[model samples]
Target: PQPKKVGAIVPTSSITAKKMASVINPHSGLPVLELGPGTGVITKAILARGIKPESLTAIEYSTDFYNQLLRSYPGVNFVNGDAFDLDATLGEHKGQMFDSVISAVPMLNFPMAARIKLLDELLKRVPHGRPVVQISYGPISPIVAQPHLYHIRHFDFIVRNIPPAQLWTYTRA
Candidate 1:
């Protein structure tokens, strides 16, 4: 088992991974960004669902996991950095907008302020009409929505997952 709690030791279940990537439009041609892609579980699922590997960028915080992913998925873009600093991590792609976001980061562990900041940054990077999908093991919304700026939609719980989880879709209101 991994020692970190911010990132799951056990990668998300295949069922959970599929649900997370379900929001992406397979033929949109727009790129998808993923956060905390701890062993490429969701990454692989995204590819299987028809998103091109080159059109996907995954940001991982752990050096160990980042190296593993680099080796595991050749030609895919893997950024080794913090998700909070989205612009810096994205570098040349800073001005690029994503079609969607699939995050496996543990948002419940962070403070509300951090969650808001991260989401705000994430939403900016996402196209105006696109969704940012986040999964949580917690029973409720991981962050409170401002309502005027963003709308929150929750998916039914996936009980087949190891700890069960909910997928929250955040989009501009």
Candidate 2:
């Protein structure tokens, strides 16, 4: 189910890509924060969902993907920062949280120690009970599917995608 770090782990697959496109919220049309948008497969999907080109924030760690993202998504806010620092980096949007935190980070690659810290920081930044979507190459959700500081709003699978994938949603409760 799980595909080893194929360059960009958890970034996304074709089937999951289609499913994510179908789920973007239509009301607020608030911005989306994409964590670890490698090569922007999901990045392009989010944009295709009608999200304003400038309302997106993509966080990338690798220098190569970072530069590539900057070039391809020049109009969006692409930050070359660590996902573990979600709160500090997004302090300006404290009370005004993002509508969604769409993550493509390979959570399985993170050691348990860092996982705890990263989850803690991310939950503090996003809206309670809102969706923080993440997809994995494995057919299961890499991040725990239960509610943490937030509620598990939704969790589903997209088996048709390459390597199979799972989509998860978490929200502040």
Candidate 3:
């Protein structure tokens, strides 16, 4: 394990790395929040997609990656906290809401129950019908999205990265 304080030990590939920062819609003009930015690879992609560092609130749990992220992108709202405690970390913005939430945390790494609970809370945090983009090495949505609460709006299969990857976009149904 890569130290509980840090986060899931395995390193995310470059393909899914950008997947973490997917969903950049300047039309919404709301803040974009990132759940886990392991090495700031996705952070760069997001900025290139036209999001300002101040427009994003990044939540990274790993101390190693946290320091790396700070060094690379200093202006973002980097919250070195737990993804499951998102509501507490971004308390004031809870009801105010965000335009989109991009996540790199792998649900497969979390226990079934914890995964379901956290996913539920995160979805509830957003108004119904907004997109939550995720990438997985496994087939289809992770086992946790079993019931399929969100509708798959876009799916991109990238062949460039190790083990390949799929960019899944979802909208609340």
Candidate 4:
């Protein structure tokens, strides 16, 4: 099922955004991939952290939000496509690797199998041991059942967000 809201009710709070972006070291020289950047909330934080805008690539499924992001963040490479189908969505950049993937997609709405597949697709594009950052509106991590392929760590929970949220990082097991 499709999520009702593209992202958080209000854009990610400054606290949430900073914590999420902090997962990637700007000087690491590795590109970052962002999923579902509804309105460039986290996108701004990533840039403010000194990561070149060109170093970041974002995938937006919503045409409305994609166009908005394309206009607002001219420096970022915003791909308008469905992240569930990574082959098609990121085909042009298949050979590229990412240091981290910051996902804002509402994965809890999907099936457990789908979540595992999503992680597999994302991690395959990331080097071994790199983190995949995911924030959930609930206390529980979005990918409830950790697949054997990933080692998950619970990060901090942001109380400042509208619904309060928890952050988790996943790396290859």
Candidate 5:
């Protein structure tokens, strides 16, 4: 029921992008992890949120977008690898902790198990109380509402984008 192939051909509306970044705390001094940054829509906003480029790390699967993002945003860390398997893809970086997570992965296109797996994998990397924020095109969050995943909060909805999207944040209970 969703576009599963790739991120939107058009850029994310700056309206949503800016709002997405505002959820993260830039002064945490800890790194920020972004999954499926696409063409750097929210990626750029995070920087504008006062997150220095070097402390903003992203994992994306597309070499096409990856190379462009690397050149466009220098000092930011970009990993063109499978975000679902952060342990394997992140390598030595897996030991690092993040202030929070900002994910744009199209989880609605995948299985519930995949979504749960991804969320658990992500939650482990962030410190306690830090959020794992998600931007989705669906009215409902892409991640399941399971108590095991802890808490969930719906922060905002953006209609300026092609399809109105929802913003949900997950944190350990």
Candidate 6:
């Protein structure tokens, strides 16, 4: 029905939002990449974790949100493009590596290529110890770990969040 096919039904409560944002090492001093910052709930929490708001980069599928996207998010790089396209999406930002990534994508809707290709691209951009964190619904991860490429980790289910939410982290092996 809508172009913004945000996967989660409940608004991300600060409990889960901050929990997802807390993983970033703000001291890393590099830009943090977020895929589809749907409601910007996690945006505020990320700042609370002491990351430079200016150094944050989020890819919003709807450039229409550019109206509110840049409203107060100064120096924040609001990329208007497709996150699945990864490298092509970061055209001008080429050669830049992020401190880590926070994903808000609904991997459930796609075929295998999207998940595999997207994960591969993310691994290339993020460093070894740093992870690609994701906010997703359901019991199992939307992106299951492949045998040779990545490792999966989890946080305790956040019961305070509506319908409960879980944070998953993927690190390249």
| Best model number under lDDT | 4
Whose lDDT is higher: candidate 1's or candidate 4's?
4
**Clash count in backbone of candidate 3:** 1
Give model 1's TM-score versus the native structure: 0.91
For candidate 6, list the clashing residue pairs, or say none: none
Q: Please report, in order, the local distance difference test score of every candidate based on alpha carbons.
A: 0.85, 0.70, 0.71, 0.86, 0.84, 0.79
| Tens digits of lDDT, candidate 6, 1-173 | 67463545756888888788878888876889888777688777877888787788888888676557788677778888888976667864456878889887777778877887788778888777678888777888878779588888986579877667888888887
**What's the distance in Å from true for residue 97, model 2?**
1.0
lDDT of 1 by residue, 109-128 (tens): 78999998888778888779
Identify the superior model by TM-score, candidate 1 or candidate 5: 1
lDDT of 2 by residue, 1-173 (tens): 98576644344675576566555674575677788888888888888888887888888888898998889887988888778776555654446557777777778888756765666566665555556676666644465544445555446776655556667666565
Q: Ten-residue segment with the worst summed lDDT in candidate 5?
A: 1-10
Rank by lDDT, highest first: 4, 1, 5, 6, 3, 2
Per-residue alpha-carbon lDDT of candidate 3 for residues 1-173, written as tens digits (9 for 90 to 100): 56353433455566666555655675577778788888776777778777878888889888888887888897888888888786667774437667777877777778777765666666676667776777766666653444466555446776665556667766665
**What's the alpha carbon RMSD for model 1?**
3.4
Q: Which should have the higher TM-score, number 1 or number 6?
A: 1
lDDT agreement of model 4 with the native: 0.86
**TM-score to true structure, per model:** 0.91, 0.79, 0.80, 0.90, 0.90, 0.88
Backbone clash count, each prediction separately: 0, 4, 1, 0, 0, 0
lDDT of 3 at 106: 76
- Could you tell me which 10 consecutive residues in candidate 2 have the lowest summed lDDT? 145-154
**Tens-digit per-residue lDDT, 1-173, candidate 4:** 88676556777788998899999977678889999999898999888888788889899999999999988998898999988888788885457898899998888778888988989789888889999999897766778656588988998888878768889999987
Model 2 RMSD in Å is 3.7
